[PDB]
């Protein structure tokens, strides 16, 4: 409720970059195949239509620090979150394809 979402869409639209939304609370699944698969679709899109700002919601459910939460496909989302950061170095640095991210704890 502190308007991260608000600023972020406002920042994207100013820079002449597209606002890719990655709905972190909707992407929750114990589905191992369908969990891994859908994340990469969202990224691929963002790259193509670059400049872009990806805004990634709550990290309290797609990549918990603690494993005393039962997760098996959100485990696989967590591994894909690293792969995204590596791929922003696909133009040198990360300037063209930038990522903002939000967490509440």
Stretch 1-20 residues interacting with Mg ion (CB under 5 A): 5
Note whether 29 binds other proteins by CB under 8 A. yes
Nearer to other proteins, 38 or 59 (CB): 38
Closest approach, Cβ 31 to other proteins, in A, equals 8
Nearer to Mg ion, 21 or 75 (CB): 21
CA distances, 54 to each of 31, 37, 69, 76, 84 (Å): 24, 18, 26, 19, 11
Note whether 7 binds other proteins by CB under 8 A. no
Two tokens at 94? 């990360």
Residue 35 bridge partners (DSSP): none
Query: Which residues does 38 contact at the CB level (< 8 Å), separation at least 6?
Result: 27
Note whether 22 binds other proteins by CB under 8 A. yes
Task: Please tell me the distance from the alpha carbon of residue 16 to that of residue 35, in angstroms, as a whole number.
Answer: 31
5 known member of a binding site: yes
Residues that bind other proteins (CB under 8 A): 1-3, 6, 20-23, 26-31, 33-34, 36-38, 40-42, 45, 61, 69-71, 74
């Amino acid at each position: 409720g502190t308007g991260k979402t608000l600023l972020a869409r406002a920042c994207a639209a100013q820079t002449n970059a597209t606002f890719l939304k990655l709905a972190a609370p909707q992407l929750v699944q114990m589905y191992i195949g369908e969990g891994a698969k859908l994340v990469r679709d969202a990224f691929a899109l963002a790259k193509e239509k670059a400049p872009t700002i990806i805004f990634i919601d709550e990290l309290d459910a797609i990549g918990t620090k603690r494993f005393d939460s039962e997760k098996s496909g959100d485990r696989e989302v967590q591994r894909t979150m690293l792969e995204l950061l590596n791929q922003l170095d696909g133009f040198s640095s990360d300037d063209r394809v930038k990522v903002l991210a939000a967490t509440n704890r």
